[PDB]
């Protein structure tokens with residue numbers, strides 16, 4: 001499985017802790033886990049940098065309760081103030097994104113193949129496909145370390161940055 | 162040599178009505194022999210319905226007693242008086258109506274599985290989604306569902322009993 | 334059925350050997366077709382019709398008390 | 404064995420095989436087995452059409468005013484009280500003529516679909532548009548009509564009961580200081596401590 | 598692949614390369630994207646230019662809200678003035694136009710052919726002229742519309 005995946009730095013198959021002794025099912029499970037983790041990390045790091053670069057907090061997140069976009073602090077303090085059913089609906093959209101199609105072993109969802117199709121690598125060129133997915137994986141790992149470091153910085157410093 | 166015993170209660174033979182079901186090959190816990198006198202399909206339907214209801218109810222109690230409350234002045238009541246304030250407010254009857262629709266269709270499911278008009282399994286409603294394709298994975302997932310359901314039944318029982326006894330949030 | 338038991342019995346034959354680990358469901362073997370047929374009986378159907386008519390009259394009297402619109 | 408596509412935990416209902424909306428085969432209770440499917444389809448189409456016209460009327464009544472003299476109330480429920488008697492009689496006459504000449508008097512559940520080629524829901528109002536097209540396209544148009552009919556039935560029910568709970572107009576939803584609907588009046592078995 | 602847009606006075610404009618990797622259906626998908634973006638950008642640019650010369654045409658916009666056609670300003674300001682129902686109807690028209698015909702690859706909808714025609718060729722070689730004119734106008738209108746966006750965003754006024 002050393003020839004699978006991305007390895008952008010090249011020659012960088014890294015089992016380090018010898019995690020994969022050789023089992024296709026466990027490796028595919030962890031590949032789905034890593035690709036999902038990377039997508040989540042990239043999205044979260046975007047939603048973490050955006051409130052600071054372009055503040056852009058227009059209007060009330062809760063017109064009835066009174067929760068304003070500009071009163072939720074950026075970072076970890078968000079999960080006390082984003083409205084109750086606001087968090088419920090965010091969770092529900094994650095549920096829709098994860099439960100619309102099947103992500104079980106033996107299905108394309110287990111490989112990360114989803115219904116987004118917002119890059120459409122054009123199968124006639126099945127060579128930029130590997131580049132696109134490798135870049136996605138590597139960027140997901142980078143934003144993975146990034147987002148966990150950002151959360152730790154938020155916890156230690158007391159605010160987002 | 163014979164009389165396959167209950168792995169849970171080792172001094173009582175396992176009820177033959179348990180054969181082919183999820184919790185029989187490892188526990189087989191039917192000491193009173195309800196499956197010997199009641200249809201095991203109906204018993205499994207009841208067990209899974211109770212487990213799912215309790216698994217929802219436990220997290221509902223957790224949320225309600227942790228401050229998770231809908232954005233409404235009428236919703237600012239404690240869990241103990243929640244099912245009097247919401248009964249008078251109306252939404253309890255509303256939940257009753259919608260769950261009654263769902264349970265009427267569940268009644269149709271039960272009264273179609275018993276006559277053989279469907280190959281539906283007792284707890285099955287068709288929701289596959291996070292369902293393994295491999296049969297062993299399906300069995301393990303069903304066992305996880307059953308164990309979580311039973312654990313949450315006991316957990317919700319304890320939660321409501323202790324909350325009524327000593328009015329507190331949840332850790333008590 | 335040598336032991337005298339009533340018709341439509343869910344009882345196993347009491348003439349059995351040493352203790353049997355058998356499944357004997359004590360619940361009536363009813364049928365959905367049979368239940369629907371029974372609820373379609375003239376007594377059942379017409380008493381249900383009478384109850385429905387009486388309740389409809391009750392609700393009309395409740396929401397429109399007396400003959401105010403005569 | 405076979406199970407309904409819409410309800411996977413219930414048997415596939417028969418008598419829905421060749422029909423416009425039958426591919427989803429949704430019939431849990433099973434009025435298909437009890438009643439003529441032609442009558443059920445005619446009733447569904449008529450309900451959907453009536454409720455679509457009712458929905459556009461309910462929405463547009465407080466707008467398009469009314470007959471010179473009557474005050475179309477913002478809440479469309481009181482329009483029946485504000486309607487002139489002559490207008491009601493004309494509406495009743497028009498509905499009776501339209502619905503009684505459509506079936507040549509065979510306007511009853513026992514006699515409507517007994518002649519022969521009475522297509523369910525085909526009153527002849529612009530059926531020529533379906534006379535062309537190509538089967539799948541015509542069935543697609545009929546399915547559009549059916550889905551819009553069901554949507555408007557549910558929507559009109561919702562509009563009526565919204566006007567009931569709010570005791571006001573349809574569009575000013577959830578007025579200021581709402582704090583939930585008022586508890587329902589009149590007694591019940593639970594009102595007298597059941 | 599030097600067609601359609603190859604009529605440009607510049608030529609087969611490929612800065613940053615792209616489409617050099619035999620990406621034939623990527624080329625067709627980018628053709629669809631270019632055609633759709635051009636059409637919407639031309640519509641937008643016309644709907645920005647018209648409200649100043651022969652300004653907001655008289656009328657009324659929202660029965661209950663008392664919004665007129667003269668109340669709603671132009672530019673990025675007008676975003677938060679059309680009522681929720683009005684924006685719903687506009688986006689519904691967008692959705693109906695998008696979903697009317699199949700835009701999947703290989704279909705006539707996969708090249709901008711939706712049967713609109715109106716200004717169409719007489720099948721006398723001017724079809725390519727018309728297609729290229731539409732493509733060039735849309736290409737220009739895209740940068741024009743982005744520039745007008747930036748002008749409204751920075752200056753604040755509709756101009």
Ligand SMILES: CC(=O)O[C@H]1CC(C)(C)C(=C=C/C(C)=C/C=C/C(C)=C/C=C/C=C(C)/C=C/C=C(C)/C=C/[C@@]23O[C@]2(C)C[C@@H](O)CC3(C)C)[C@](C)(O)C1
Pocket residue numbers: 118119673746747748749750751752
């Ligand atoms: C206060 C003040 O004065 O500040 C002002 C500031 C300002 C800016 C003036 C304002 C304004 C006006 C506006 C509305 C400005 C709009 C700007 C827009 C719409 C930007 C969208 C870019 C979309 C892109 C690039 C999509 C790009 C898509 C791409 C690149 C696709 C890229 C592909 O990689 C993908 C996805 C697959 C590849 O295989 C192929 C290719 C094509 C390369 C404000 C906000 O009002 C206020």
Ligand code: KC1
Pocket residue numbers: 061062063064065082083084085086087089090091092093232
């Ligand atoms: C078209 C369907 C739809 C409607 C019609 C709708 C409407 C309302 N949404 Mg919702 N919503 C989605 C769909 C819809 N929302 C989706 C797909 C998401 C992505 C996850 C999403 C996100 C949030 C968040 C994060 C919050 C939120 C709330 C409210 C709210 C206020 C009620 C009130 O103020 O009484 C109303 C009326 C905010 C809140 O205030 O809840 C109290 C809150 O925080 N929503």
Ligand SMILES: CC1=C(C#C/C(C)=C/C=C/C(C)=C/C=C/C=C(C)/C=C/C=C(C)/C=C/[C@@]23O[C@]2(C)C[C@@H](O)CC3(C)C)C(C)(C)C[C@H](O)C1
Pocket residue numbers: 188307308311312313315326
């Ligand atoms: C085995 C098994 C499982 C399991 C399990 C588990 C965890 C089972 C646990 C079951 C459990 C934990 C059952 C509770 C008993 C507690 C009781 C009865 C309380 C008595 C308390 C009473 C009667 C109250 C007494 C008083 O109130 C009085 C009378 C008045 C007060 O003044 C004084 C006090 C308060 C003292 C899985 C994993 C879930 C599924 C798997 O498949 C099989």
Ligand SMILES: CC1=C(C#C/C(C)=C/C=C/C(C)=C/C=C/C=C(C)/C=C/C=C(C)/C=C/[C@@]23O[C@]2(C)C[C@@H](O)CC3(C)C)C(C)(C)C[C@H](O)C1
Pocket residue numbers: 455456458459528529530551552554555557558559561562565573576
């Ligand atoms: C057939 C025929 C013809 C015809 C025709 C006609 C008349 C066709 C008409 C079609 C028509 C009239 C279709 C309406 C649909 C209405 C819907 C779907 C309602 C949605 C409403 C919904 C979904 C819900 C609304 C809500 O209100 C609810 C429930 C609660 C409120 O709080 C919130 C809101 C407001 C959101 C020709 C062409 C004239 C001649 C030809 O020869 C024959």
